[PDB]
Ligand binder design. Structure first.
Ligand SMILES: O=P(O)(O)O[C@H]1[C@H](OP(=O)(O)O)[C@@H](OP(=O)(O)O)[C@H](OP(=O)(O)O)[C@@H](OP(=O)(O)O)[C@H]1OP(=O)(O)O
Ligand SMILES: [Mg+2]
Ligand SMILES: [Mg+2]
Ligand SMILES: [Mg+2]
Ligand SMILES: [Mg+2]
Ligand SMILES: [Zn+2]
Ligand SMILES: [Zn+2]
Ligand SMILES: [Zn+2]
Lengths: 193, 50, 145, 292, 261
RNA sequence: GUUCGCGAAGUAACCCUUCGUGGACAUUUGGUCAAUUUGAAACAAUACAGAGAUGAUCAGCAGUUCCCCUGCAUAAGGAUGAACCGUUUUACAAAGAGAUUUA
């Protein structure tokens, strides 16, 4: 609904939450169809969420055994950087990704004592807590991030945008204050007219 | 008429203040009384020095 | 609300769109209440919007810490026994469903089928007799005053 | 000021008869119909069990500048529309008073933020300046196409037959209809005469009037009604050749009738506007020939 | 009464027989928020209404009659109301009793309950303005309505006189052939508002005609609000009635000051 | 419907059933909102143009505006985002000459 309210009907959002354009885009369409970090980050959370929920669907349908299920979730929560590509939009999540990799190294070598290299290890609890704590940090963030986005949809941009001084516009703003100060002092000197 | 004024329980998902948009409004000036610009009169002789 | 083509959904489309800021919270309450490997199915208590906008899972997962530690430990042994004596273990492919197909509805597909066998250690009736009845409940000893 | 705002201006007849009314205030509800700028939408119901919500459509600034209520937008005193209010003051001061409204969205918002009154809102909301003009209303009450070939059509209009009892017809030919006198007023006068009121349910009579040709015809079903239409008309005019014509009698007007003795249909009066004007010009002589 | 209060209202359209809520496809992808088609060139996007109001047939008692509803069913006028006798709004042509109930309410909104606007829509279509008590309809688009029959210049006026007479009391009907359009003026504004939505996108085919199977292929006739009448033969009639309206109000207004004193 | 009474009839023997009749319990939902053309999204396509200093070729950063767009944004980008590049007459007098009036 958000994509189609913006008029971006040529972007197809599939059921696995990949966002692909359906056609070659003109430059005016490419500028309009640029979606921010808050949109994509919201999408990547759902892509991570659906990827978990689909495995519980696979278990319940009977395609997947419970040992495969527990290994499946443990495969998800360790490989979210590879499976989803959340990092691109919030690169702080590499702390959680390198933490889940580090827990994967600890868990496997206590698990695979006297066992061969093989896929099945379903102790997903350590990796589970890392994501829940990452979700805890980004709940106040995205609510601010999307809450500005949705109000920009309903109300529009404020017309009172005041640009702060920055490194790029410091030299121009230094000149505006300098021409004003010289203008004021000379105009007092002037007797009249 | 004595009229009780109550507030409606807002839906937390629907946008509160549905009439609030980011629009631009130009304001008229309310000029009822003129302000007298009260200088003094006129040391007004001046050559071409300025 | 699968196909909101009608004019009647103009307010309910706004309710979908305004619920997007709360969606992040709804992912947390879903994932924190996820069924552990010893449970077939978990009945959670949900709070939903009347236009079907968002569905928060209105619970917090409380566990008894020595019970919880035993429950992972039992599944930890049960998976080490499993990986030892499997001829071949087939890890499932990801993503499990193709992107073109919609998520299949709960009731036409999931609700009718028998669930499956959850991960359980086999147990010793002489060694584990105090816990063997209630160790794998959804909330263990919940009704025991 | 967003924390100091006026109370809303609503009529007594919008609020109705009951004493206590539960009204709902929404601090930035809808936007105003006039200035297109948001306001506090008040809405309420007359009784508890009613079925119509009465909303405030305009803001209090647009309601003050016109001196109208926010709900029905009638004037707060005299309870009349704004277009009729500014016309009644125009007959007293002998000059046009008028509230003019911008079509421009930047000039709808501009015109509301000024603290003036518009139109007759200086006269109204001053009770002394309103009652004396009502007194000045009272003295006013003390005063209290020659090239057209029309000959194909006038053969079909009767124009030479008499309004007697003896022909039994369904249709009649009404001429001498002014450019005033609306089509509903002639059907109501005939149905008042026969007592066949609520005629549009049963479709007892069907009437066609051109208003350019100043002529028309009315068709009856069930020809026995035709003798009731003949016998319930008393006054007739006899042309000094003969050929008596009945008069329908709309207030201050006179409409002549002759039994058509066939169904006239549409287009009997004319098939072009330029052509129909000459039939009224054709008739005006025959009316003067009938009377004088 | 005999035609209306005697029976109950009947279901005009079955709820399965209702049209699809998506429009006819004029684009490449369907837009979900704005229920329209997006990547499309253009379209006339106007079509003949498949339904019509038989006034003496479909009228009857409804739920809103017992409830004291003031407003008329918009779909009843389109010939589309699927609720029938269970519907909250009224199902009959407006009468002097009905409009007297609407007298406090008609000033700001139509007989269907929809709120009127400050100025008219640009093409003079739509709901209408509360600044002008317009009672005259502009009947346009007659060529696509007749499915391109020639018929006459003035047999066109016969069909317009036939249909709109069922929808209430008429002040006058004027047809203009050179402009190919009609001007229907009603006794009440409420009938004009009712007949406007009744006769939008309709056809004048009269079944007996040979095109009655192809009534659907055509365009449909625009019923729009009418402008002021430019001849001074009508202009002087306006200030005459505006005079008479003013005299009838002053008598009502001095009685208010009589009670005020 | 429940419960407390009272009365009548029947079975009874002060209980059960029946229907008469007091009580008590419970007390005013929802709508700013109607289901396709006529109360309003926008793109794309077609035709015609075709990127600021300048001699040519390249970076820009601003300002003003009742223009905004994308963006979480007070960051940044949008051709240096665009629009600017036109039109242009009185706070007006003081001196010094030849034609034309006036009466
Ligand atoms: O490829 P390497 O870097 O040499 O290490 C691999 C790799 O783990 P890491 O990438 O974390 O090191 C495998 O995981 P993937 O790269 O395929 O995701 C992992 O197996 P999994 O695929 O099941 O995680 C495997 O260990 P094992 O086969 O015991 O699970 C482990 O090599 P080791 O045998 O040295 O652990
Ligand atoms: Mg820039
Ligand atoms: Mg450049
Ligand atoms: Mg650039
Ligand atoms: Mg710029
Ligand atoms: Zn206003
Ligand atoms: Zn009012
Ligand atoms: Zn209905």
């Amino acid at each position: 609904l958000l994509i189609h309210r913006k008029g971006l009907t040529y972007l197809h959002l599939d059921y696995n939450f990949n966002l692909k354009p359906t056609k070659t885009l003109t430059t005016k369409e490419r500028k309009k169809s640029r979606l921010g970090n808050s949109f994509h980050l919201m999408r990547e959370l759902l892509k991570m969420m659906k990827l978990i929920v689909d495995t519980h669907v696979q278990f319940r349908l009977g395609n997947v055994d419970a040992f495969q299920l527990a290994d499946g979730i443990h495969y998800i929560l360790n490989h979210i950087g590879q499976l989803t590509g959340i990092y691109r939009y919030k690169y702080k999540v590499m702390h959680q990704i390198r933490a889940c990799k580090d827990l994967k190294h600890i868990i496997y070598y206590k698990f695979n004592k006297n066992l061969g290299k093989g896929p099945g290890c379903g102790f997903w609890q350590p990796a589970w807590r890392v994501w829940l704590n990452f979700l805890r940090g980004t709940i106040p963030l995205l609510e601010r991030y999307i809450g500005n986005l949705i109000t920009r949809q309903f109300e529009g941009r404020s017309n009172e945008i005041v640009k702060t001084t920055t490194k790029q516009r410091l030299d121009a703003y230094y000149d505006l204050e300098l021409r004003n100060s010289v203008m004021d002092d000379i105009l007092e000197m002037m007797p009249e007219s | 008429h004595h009229i009780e004024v109550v507030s409606k329980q807002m839906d937390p998902l629907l946008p509160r203040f549905v009439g609030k948009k980011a629009r631009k409004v130009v304001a008229p000036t309310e000029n009822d009384e003129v302000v007298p610009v009260l200088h003094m009169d006129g040391g007004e002789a001046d050559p071409n020095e300025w | 609300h699968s196909d909101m083509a009608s004019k009647m959904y103009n307010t309910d489309k706004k309710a979908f769109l305004g619920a997007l800021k709360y969606l992040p919270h709804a992912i947390l309450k879903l994932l924190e209440n996820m069924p552990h490997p010893w449970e077939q199915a978990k009945e959670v208590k949900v709070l939903y919007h009347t236009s079907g906008a968002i569905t928060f899972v209105n619970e917090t997962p409380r566990v008894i810490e020595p019970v919880y530690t035993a429950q992972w430990s039992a599944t930890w042994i049960a998976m080490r026994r499993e990986k030892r004596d499997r001829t071949h273990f087939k890890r499932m492919r990801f993503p499990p469903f193709d992107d073109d197909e919609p998520p299949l509805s709960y009731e036409q597909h999931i609700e009718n089928i028998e669930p499956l066998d959850p991960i359980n250690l086999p147990l010793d009736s002489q060694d584990d007799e105090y816990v063997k009845d209630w160790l794998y409940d959804s909330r263990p000893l919940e009704e025991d005053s | 000021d967003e924390i100091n705002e006026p109370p809303p201006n609503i009529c007594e007849q919008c609020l109705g008869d009951e004493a206590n009314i539960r009204m709902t205030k929404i601090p930035q509800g809808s936007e105003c119909k006039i200035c297109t700028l948001p306001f506090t939408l008040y809405h309420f119901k007359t009784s508890k069990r009613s079925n119509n919500i009465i909303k405030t459509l305009i803001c209090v600034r647009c309601a003050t500048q016109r001196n109208i209520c926010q709900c029905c937008m009638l004037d707060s005193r005299w309870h009349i529309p704004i277009q009729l209010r500014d016309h009644l003051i125009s007959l007293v001061n002998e000059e046009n008073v008028m509230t003019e409204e911008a079509k421009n969205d930047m000039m709808k918002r501009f015109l509301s933020l000024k603290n003036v009154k518009l139109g007759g809102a200086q006269i109204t909301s001053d009770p002394s300046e309103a009652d004396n003009i009502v007194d000045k209303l009272k003295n006013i009450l003390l005063r209290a196409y020659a090239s057209v070939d029309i000959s194909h059509i006038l053969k079909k209009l009767p124009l030479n037959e008499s309004f007697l009892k003896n022909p039994s017809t369904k249709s009649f030919f009404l001429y001498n209809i002014d450019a005033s006198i609306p089509e509903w007023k002639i059907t109501d006068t005939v149905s008042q005469l026969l007592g066949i009121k609520k005629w549009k349910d049963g479709n007892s009579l069907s009437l066609i009037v051109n208003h350019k040709a100043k002529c028309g015809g009315l068709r009856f079903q069930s020809s026995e009604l035709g003798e009731r239409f003949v016998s319930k008309i008393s006054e007739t005019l006899v042309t000094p050749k003969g050929l008596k014509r009945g008069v329908l009698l709309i207030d201050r007007f006179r409409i002549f009738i002759i039994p058509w003795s066939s169904g006239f249909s549409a287009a009997s009066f004319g098939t072009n506007t330029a052509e129909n004007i000459k039939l009224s010009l054709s008739l005006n002589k025959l009316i003067q020939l009938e009377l004088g | 009464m005999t035609s209306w209060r005697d029976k109950s209202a009947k279901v005009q359209v079955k709820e399965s027989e209702l049209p699809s809520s998506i429009p006819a496809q004029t684009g490449l992808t369907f837009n979900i928020w704005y229920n329209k088609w997006s990547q499309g060139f253009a379209g006339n996007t106007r079509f003949v209404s498949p339904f019509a109001l038989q006034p003496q047939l479909h009228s009857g008692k409804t739920r809103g009659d017992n409830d004291g509803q003031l407003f008329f069913c918009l779909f009843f006028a389109k010939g589309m109301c699927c609720l029938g006798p269970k519907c909250e709004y009224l199902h009959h042509i407006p009468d002097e009793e009905d409009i007297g109930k609407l007298a406090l309410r008609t000033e700001v909104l139509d007989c269907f309950g929809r709120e009127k606007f400050a100025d008219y829509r640009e093409d003079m279509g739509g709901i209408g303005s509360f600044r002008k008590k317009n009672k005259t309809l502009y009947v346009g688009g007659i060529d696509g309505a007749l499915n391109s029959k020639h018929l006459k210049p003035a047999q066109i006026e016969s069909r317009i006189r036939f249909v709109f007479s069922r929808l209430g009391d008429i002040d006058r009907i004027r047809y203009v052939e050179s402009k190919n359009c009609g001007f229907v003026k009603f006794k009440y504004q409420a009938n004009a508002e009712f007949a406007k939505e009744a006769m939008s996108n309709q056809t004048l085919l009269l079944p007996s005609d040979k095109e009655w199977d192809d009534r659907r292929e055509g365009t449909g006739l625009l019923v729009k609000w009418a402008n002021e009448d430019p001849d001074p033969a009508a202009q002087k009639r306006l200030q005459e009635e505006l005079k008479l309206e003013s005299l009838n109000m002053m008598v009502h207004l001095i009685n208010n000051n009589t009670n005020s004193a």
